């Protein structure tokens, strides 16, 4: 089935085909002059996939308020349908990341719907940072590292349930992000809390299938405002190393202290074989969860420069999981996810253009200016023609958002789904 | 009316009276050796008040979740009852700051309940950062600075209504904090947005009584994650200077960029007569809204040092409004507000101990080391005995939290109020299907 | 000609074919977008940014300085090196002088300038360090020092800078001081600012009718607790207090972490106090790195505000543009060349923004298309425009490549003695 | 004695009465709290922190240096000044040396130290600056430099630092380098770290059985884009990779804004890699200000982890303590005196924490009472304990007051030639 009429896609592609041919041919000639085969780049670009977050498909909100748009998805099934659109138009998002219990539903049905939509499932995400109705033990003071044994046991059991759901739909990994921490000095004993967390994660690891990976995600702060158990990549490395070969670290771009050199963290985790994957998004102040590359596109390019360098250096067994983790508070979620996926492919494409041999020479000779200019020559290259052609060749849209709007999809689901009501956030009752 | 049994207060005071006498006399002797009359300090401390936020009386939450405790207040009336306790035990929070429409109710009933509880009302707070039921225009893309004229008018009208409610209950100021801004470069034109905001505020200003003040509150980010119209004190000054004499700037401690020297901003606003008031709280990362002084007590003291210096040298009827703006996500809201109000008095009392004459000398002398030590001599002084004695002499408790727990108040209201249910924040929408 | 014309000609010819192809390709793409590449190139070739005399020699940190070969011996060698930057990029006709570092006979400075085809931008005073024969030290401050005599000495220094500038063609004085405190209590914030305001008021009195006085804020360094002129808010208060000739200078690396610098630029423009810019890039503090080498988008967003100002018809808006960088690990001339290039690059992209479309997206609160409208301009590779602008004006298609081909560094290395002490 | 004993005696008697009143009052308050003030005083008397040889001279920034009077020149002058701090505070018996700045005949150094009653803490190598005659420059790095010969030179220097230390009684080598990049692409993050690890392994091999090797991480400066040993994570990787004798050194001012430093301390302790501390305070970057002058609670919170670690009986826990500060606007000796005082102040307050009560509030998730439990200790004015500890060990009740009364600064000013006066 096609969420977007194929005739609309065809029409909107033909409308822009001429210009694209001109832009692609021009870029091809320029790249050829630079000793690069544009065809080889396009080939790799059409193979780069990033998973879309189920929680980013509906309108997001802050602790102050939520302003839903029209046709908000009612649940996971509506979210999958909307994800199908993103994949149909960008062809870069074949897999969806589920979050439990937000996406709780019959696994068999989820798989059925996914297969029918041409969508797969990436890493499962557990939720022990919030309480569900009827929950026996509250996670107010923590979960996997809570002082109460019964509470830690409950959190561990929930994670095992996520794994069971994942095994039924085809997922091969579990991502664990918890809010565990403290808001006041002395509230928690840093070491004992970490010990409790490590012991609980060990139980999860014990129940982890041997064809699965366990990703732990660090975050400097929020919901905890004084200390956080898994606060940075250093603690994260200790966790992954301690748990086992199947445990790795997940890097969410917005979870670092101000001015942190994140691409270096990426390089370090790769060197020690603990880079499990990414949660892509952009930010300017905190964990803003904004559209990838919308704030600092060069940083995104520099992260991908480390990933490509890894391949260039000959690193093996390196297949990090790529996922988008964003919240869309003031835009049409589908459009933002479409362009964010595009931006990630944009950074990847530019990273592929780096003349590795030239860069290597300038680094060895300590020619800092030419070294940086070598990266800039790749980053300054407008690879949109490549991104658009990759989409066109694989069944997608030359201009995804334009086609999305021309299809009238949003108004369509707005009529099929109940209206929404704006409200406040979690700051007060 | 006494939320806390007088017999309990008296009992818990006598239980700690002997120790307090010893500590107070010891501190009194130490200060005397330092040329300071402890009684003069205690007298000023007893008179220092900070307003409590009604929205801080209930348990707070984040965008990820809310974990309510037992006996959660149902509405403004329950919250007023709970604030009565903070004031009874600390004697430092006689006034409550209201938020509309969260606390919207008959002004006569509000004023009536306040008088019965011995509570007054501080500045009103408007809410155009969220949508209410039946609202004609959404504030999703802004309010007072929204591109849509009808939306700006609705926001201005809401604020004018806040002034009306405030006039009826005894409030004398309106604090305006909005989320207006953008999440993406290009989404907003910085200049046009600010011009729209200034025009809208001008209309609100026209509705201010002669003895009222309009406080604009700056914030670097959140809910807007790229730009915010009223992002810092610089823009805040431009606003206040443009609007008029009744318009001043409100400084919320957790609303500044990392490493900002906040005490300097306070001094600058005082110098130009635009320091409207404060929203006290503490933080380490962003606008954490944590208990005042729980993270960086010295910073709080340094802010009060600027306030006391200005006071010491008599300045233009200088009377900034002191208010607490905190969210309590992992503690009993009443206990945190009690200790937060205590910390604010602690920093004030310590600031009063600074030898101003000596400090001035070291400053003109460029004796950096002795100047900083002059402040530290005051800051290092444990003034808890003064704070406790001030409370004891005015009908409060020597150890407020201890008395609060001994009274069993939380269990009491918990049995009177409906049970609450933990849930998520506004990060994602409902998902029942 | 610091760089032999035959070398510039040879290197341009070697790259002419590729430039032709890229420029024409870009031209057709822009035409399809409703933009006339010639109109953009005509504006770019006229965008100038002043080069800092103090950035022509190798810089250093408090830990060490690692000079390269042929370091300029003084201001005259520095002007000679600046002549290279201008000849190759054609984007830096003016130089920013710093007194007393560049103190010399005004007549001689001017003669070397005219001889090289260089002019002079804003003068820069120096009361953040002590010079020989100084009656009062600036250890504890300068224009805001508690000692009246010290403030007077600093005022006189600034007036001398104005006298030197008037003689060479300058039309402005930039004032950056380190005044502040390293400990709470050391300074009375308000009295320190009042002292500064009184001192600046005196300097303002020495300003010719057509001169400007720029005050530059900085969050910290050298002061590590408080700084008198710490941010744009205090800077605005200064400019507003002093008068029409007083404006604020924004140095990109002088703001708190995560600050929205482009908004500060917009705010100052709205109130007519944006005097000028000190361009550079950074990641941690006031790193003074090559412009756009770390965050090229931020640079573009700043220029987006500058071009919007013109779009909105702001009157008498002529900000001074200057580079303020230190080069510790590269050939200063090459970094200044590419930095000037980066600035013109961001400017050119700002010119490509479809302001009509953007205005529409802003009014309809279409956040996604509004940001995409900015990105459509920023993602455009304008290098062909920059290179064509240089070709037309006597510059080099590839400045650094032509610079290296000329062997200029090796030449001056043999002419200039390295300092031994 | 650098400071006449009769002066110390006179200034102690002058403040003896008030001290007695405050000590007895504090003694009674602590008694009511179940603590014996005598036990705390005994412990404080035994807490020592190393003073940096490079801290007794006046410091500066990249913009300027404003030396005071009696500036010590050379390690011998510096040792004489360090002796004053130890005599008056009795908290700094050991000095940290930096090579080549303090290079001198080991025998003479050891002899001067013994004569002044000073020992020697960890040695500090210097490959972040070039010494005259040096064969290879450290402009682009040292231990991680791309050039093999440069790395070997850096390694040899560190080995020489170990040789010097062994001769004077030192038992550890601290390695802090500026290695990194100022531009993206300039360095290959991974390869640079690999080179560093290989070089450090060579240094590790020259370590005596009873020696420790400390690596010090730093977010930035002198490198403004990336730094090889940028944070504690990389630092842990270095220590774990090198072996049991290698540990991480934590300098309070070397972390990203808002970093929770006390947590890093806890994590390093848990994994047995907390080698030591470089104490100082800051507000913006690596400001190197007097310990506790900006954020005293943070300092107390770091000590809370240290004291908890002992209370827990953690193995491999025996960190070194050193002050690493720069004094640009105060008398270096007075600042080091009060900084050592602040460090003992934080230690004393941490000792007052009711560990039993705290543990209970943590287990029951009583966050409010848990933090108030820490505050009860931190709010306690322990000055009487610090003062009595000094009085009892040959020091001064009020160190700075005695120092000033002694006229020491004027004394050395009359013995040492300033650049100009
Ligand atoms: C939804 C998801 O669990 C969540 O966003 C985490 O990955 C982390 O980014 C939270 O800040
Ligand atoms: C509830 C109140 O309006 C709010 O807290 C504001 O004062 C401001 O702090 C928001 O960040
Ligand atoms: C050299 C020049 O005065 C200086 O760079 C100032 O402009 C300012 O950037 C200092 O941080
Ligand atoms: C002088 C000493 O080696 C130096 O201060 C290092 O320890 C580190 O702090 C540098 O930033
Ligand atoms: Mn995430
Ligand atoms: Mn997140
Ligand atoms: Mn507030
Ligand atoms: Mn707030
Ligand atoms: Mn500058
Ligand atoms: Mn600067
Ligand atoms: Mn150090
Ligand atoms: Mn340092």
PDB file of C-alpha atoms and ligand atoms in Angstrom, chain A residues 63-64, chain B residues 177 217-219 221-222 252 254-255 279 281 287-289 325 327, ligand 8:
ATOM      1  CA  UNK A  63       6.952  20.937  30.615  1.00  0.00           C
ATOM      2  CA  UNK A  64       5.018  24.169  30.012  1.00  0.00           C
TER       3      UNK A  64
ATOM      4  CA  UNK B 177       6.765  35.766  31.479  1.00  0.00           C
ATOM      5  CA  UNK B 217      10.899  38.328  33.137  1.00  0.00           C
ATOM      6  CA  UNK B 218      13.740  37.392  30.787  1.00  0.00           C
ATOM      7  CA  UNK B 219      14.807  33.817  30.063  1.00  0.00           C
ATOM      8  CA  UNK B 221      15.649  29.533  26.436  1.00  0.00           C
ATOM      9  CA  UNK B 222      12.753  27.085  27.020  1.00  0.00           C
ATOM     10  CA  UNK B 252      14.896  34.678  37.940  1.00  0.00           C
ATOM     11  CA  UNK B 254      17.980  30.085  36.790  1.00  0.00           C
ATOM     12  CA  UNK B 255      17.293  32.009  33.569  1.00  0.00           C
ATOM     13  CA  UNK B 279      12.346  34.839  41.368  1.00  0.00           C
ATOM     14  CA  UNK B 281      15.646  29.271  43.229  1.00  0.00           C
ATOM     15  CA  UNK B 287      16.272  26.470  34.669  1.00  0.00           C
ATOM     16  CA  UNK B 288      16.242  23.603  37.180  1.00  0.00           C
ATOM     17  CA  UNK B 289      13.950  25.432  39.638  1.00  0.00           C
ATOM     18  CA  UNK B 325       9.856  30.414  41.918  1.00  0.00           C
ATOM     19  CA  UNK B 327       9.207  23.317  41.428  1.00  0.00           C
TER      20      UNK B 327
HETATM   21 MN1  LIG E   8      11.753  29.609  34.941  1.00  0.00          MN
END
